[PDB]
Design a protein around this ligand. Structure first.
Ligand SMILES: Cc1cc2nc3c(=O)[nH]c(=O)nc-3n(C[C@H](O)[C@H](O)[C@H](O)COP(=O)(O)OP(=O)(O)OC[C@H]3O[C@@H](n4cnc5c(N)ncnc54)[C@H](O)[C@@H]3O)c2cc1C
Ligand SMILES: Cc1cc2nc3c(=O)[nH]c(=O)nc-3n(C[C@H](O)[C@H](O)[C@H](O)COP(=O)(O)OP(=O)(O)OC[C@H]3O[C@@H](n4cnc5c(N)ncnc54)[C@H](O)[C@@H]3O)c2cc1C
Ligand SMILES: [Cl-]
Ligand SMILES: [Cl-]
Ligand SMILES: [Cl-]
Ligand SMILES: [Cl-]
Ligand SMILES: [Cl-]
Lengths: 398, 397
């Protein structure tokens, strides 16, 4: 058949692709989203839960915040647990007013999907072998297969919002991108349960046996994590083994108040820090997990995706409304400045709260311990953590 | 016959002299034994920056007159990254705390003159000093001088004998545990009779490597350059030193730098080293005998001073209040502050030096990000400033 036509072709219907598309459509910039999996499959992913104010603001601007505001929970603080002691970080007081919002990525994604349904902005699911073409040409395009037919999308710009295993990043020629990576010797084993959270705020716990995070998605939906060796598989961890181990890494007081229950979802995510430079090539712009990855210890993943969306969205508005086509050259510079800040903090928190075993020498272990002392005791240290946790500012586009 | 005292002190460097001066004043007898001659000890060119805790201690010891007259109070320090100058107003950021620039040699000289005036015994050129009966109730030292073996009977031994001392090596095998990080570089220092390029210290990170613009007075400058461990001082002419220093500074700063012939020039290797515990029986390790820091945080002499402070306050209570229980608190107290200083010294070293290929691309990227974060965040600067002026001494109660 004949080629579909739009202004911005978006690869990936995850939070990045959907939010970008929603913001663009509201601003009168035509876009089409193509996604490899089914709508159901995308919604089945249990991932992030902590939204920085910048992300919340973007969602409000996109006009998809009614449910987030009603069913989400503003968290004014977080706890770091070292040596069995519970240290609360009053993010609100430490930052002079900032907070975080606990609302599931799945929920955010569902809201964005319902909003796109209402607008009628085209979105195509179960699209196989999406390939971008003529990234340097003036007329880039996408091809894909669906319903046993090759389909084409002509556009001006391509936004690669296709995640860690996307096609976007891989479509850029060799030499162009440079990669910076740190692979951690552990993953997070996550368990979502239909049970009351043990605390009204997140508890990041460092314990001799290893790291543990007590989290949640609502007043009736809990999310717990344990660091685990890379070899470990989710089949080796029954619901009971996970509950017992979580209990062993928490103080007796918290262990007793913990209400356990069957896992609605359980899986292991390997931890890695990854960044590519630049985050664009010609008319293709990499957004979110397609460009960078962080360990979730700082709750920065989805929030960095959102800042990437922020910058590309505000540049594109000026490209089409003010004809400033060349402003797109500042996308990577802007995005990367904030990516490195979040990457730094995510790296810092991972080093601070995890058991590295033989992967760190004796000196580095002592420095981990002295950092745990200093950062949770010094008022300036607590302020260092709090201001990073709530999310550093977005810079203005010139 | 044998010499008798309460506390026998090994080493006549800053640790040993300050501990001896404080103890003597409190009425606690002490003898100091030193391997080198007095002249040789004075020939050493090292520290220059004193925390208020160290300044307070010297005033308490009654050896502050010359420091209060010739030392210079610094209200800030500068950190320099990619041309940017970030002044840390220590006073404004820490609620009034400052640092004192006064040479370690000057402090050492003043202490030596005060002990001479008091007549508290001190023995130079004490060879093969050895401690014995560390856990017994009657510990003692032996040493050789003027062709004869001499003995000092005491109640406690203070090992203030530095990195190459005998005290640490005298403790039975396996008791001590050594934590260490050896840096792939040293500091080439040059003392010059020229005006400092700035009235405050300048810690400069540069693609080519770290440089420190420091001073001993308004007429005497002290500059440092990081150099690889292979380097020998004989490979560094004054000319090469000056040119390299200028290459590591913004052109606008280098332009007015006044160069001159070296009065002293040597390379010190950098290392982070902590020994635990810091005592065995009636033997206590003090200062460099127990721990080393890279000088990037100006913590060395200052940690030695806090070790001295704790051992001194404990001994006062031991002798005047029979608080023998408190001797077990020396290592816990000293190590709490030592680890904090070690952390800071490590932090500053990581932040400001070039590690070449001793650091992978990811760690270089985290250095770059740390320099961006700590030097632009108000909280980041507070963090550095409060560590730089030195964290408080805890009370020995
Ligand atoms: C497995 C996993 C677990 C995580 N857990 C946590 C956590 O516990 N806490 C936390 O704070 N953060 C977590 N994160 C981080 C956070 O969820 C991500 O940063 C966030 O999902 C990034 O959104 P995105 O839209 O950039 O990528 P994604 O959410 O991955 O969306 C990418 C979309 O593109 C689609 N796609 C991929 N390839 C193609 C193709 N060739 N053609 C078309 N479409 C394609 C995918 O199907 C997907 O729907 C996790 C991330 C992952 C991947
Ligand atoms: C080479 C070097 C360079 C340094 N440079 C700097 C710098 O540039 N900036 C900075 O801030 N800090 C620096 N420092 C750190 C700071 O000067 C030290 O922390 C400080 O000197 C510690 O004092 P101390 O008395 O504990 O040890 P020392 O000053 O080493 O005194 C130990 C004394 O014990 C004596 N002794 C050793 N063995 C025996 C024995 N068996 N019997 C009898 N006596 C013995 C020694 O002769 C010496 O006099 C440096 C340290 C060293 C070693
Ligand atoms: Cl979720
Ligand atoms: Cl931090
Ligand atoms: Cl941030
Ligand atoms: Cl811009
Ligand atoms: Cl300190």
């Amino acid at each position: 058949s004949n080629a579909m036509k739009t202004q911005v072709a978006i690869i990936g219907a995850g939070p990045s692709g959907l939010l970008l598309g929603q913001l663009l459509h509201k601003a009168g910039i035509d876009n089409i989203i193509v996604e490899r999996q089914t709508a159901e499959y995308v919604l089945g992913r249990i991932r992030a839960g902590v939204l920085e104010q910048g992300t919340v603001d973007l969602l409000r601007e996109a006009g998809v915040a009614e449910r987030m505001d009603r069913e989400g929970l503003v968290h004014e603080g977080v706890e770091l647990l070292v040596g069995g002691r519970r240290q609360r970080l009053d993010l609100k007081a430490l930052t002079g007013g900032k907070t975080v919002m606990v609302y599931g990525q799945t929920e955010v994604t569902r809201d964005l999907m319902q909003a796109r349904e209402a607008s009628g902005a085209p979105i195509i699911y179960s699209a196989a072998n999406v390939q971008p073409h003529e990234l340097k040409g003036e007329k880039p395009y996408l091809t894909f297969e669906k319903d046993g037919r090759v389909q084409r999308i002509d556009c001006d710009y391509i936004a690669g919002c296709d995640g860690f295993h996307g096609i976007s990043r891989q479509s850029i020629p060799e030499g162009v991108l440079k990669q910076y990576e740190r692979v951690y010797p552990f993953g997070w084993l996550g368990l979502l349960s239909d049970t009351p959270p043990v605390n009204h705020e997140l508890i990041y716990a460092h314990h001799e046996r290893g790291f543990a995070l007590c989290s949640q998605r609502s007043q009736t939906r809990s999310r717990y994590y344990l660091q685990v060796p890379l070899q470990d598989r989710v089949e080796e961890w029954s619901d009971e083994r996970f509950w017992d181990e979580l209990k062993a890494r928490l103080p007796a007081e918290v262990a007793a108040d913990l209400v356990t229950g069957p896992a609605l979802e359980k899986s292991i995510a390997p931890l890695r820090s990854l960044v590519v430079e630049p985050m664009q090539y010609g008319h293709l712009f990499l957004v979110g997990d397609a460009a960078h990855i962080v360990p979730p210890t700082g709750a920065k993943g989805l929030n960095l995706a959102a800042s990437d969306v922020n910058y590309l969205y505000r540049i594109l508005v000026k490209v089409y409304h003010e004809g400033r086509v060349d402003l797109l050259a500042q996308y990577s510079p802007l995005a990367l400045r904030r990516v490195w800040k979040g990457e730094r903090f995510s790296w810092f928190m991972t080093q601070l709260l995890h058991d590295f075993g033989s992967h760190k020498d004796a000196w580095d272990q002592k420095m981990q311990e002295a950092d745990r002392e200093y950062f949770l005791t010094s008022p300036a240290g607590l302020v260092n953590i709090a201001e990073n946790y709530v999310g550093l500012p977005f810079e203005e586009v010139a």
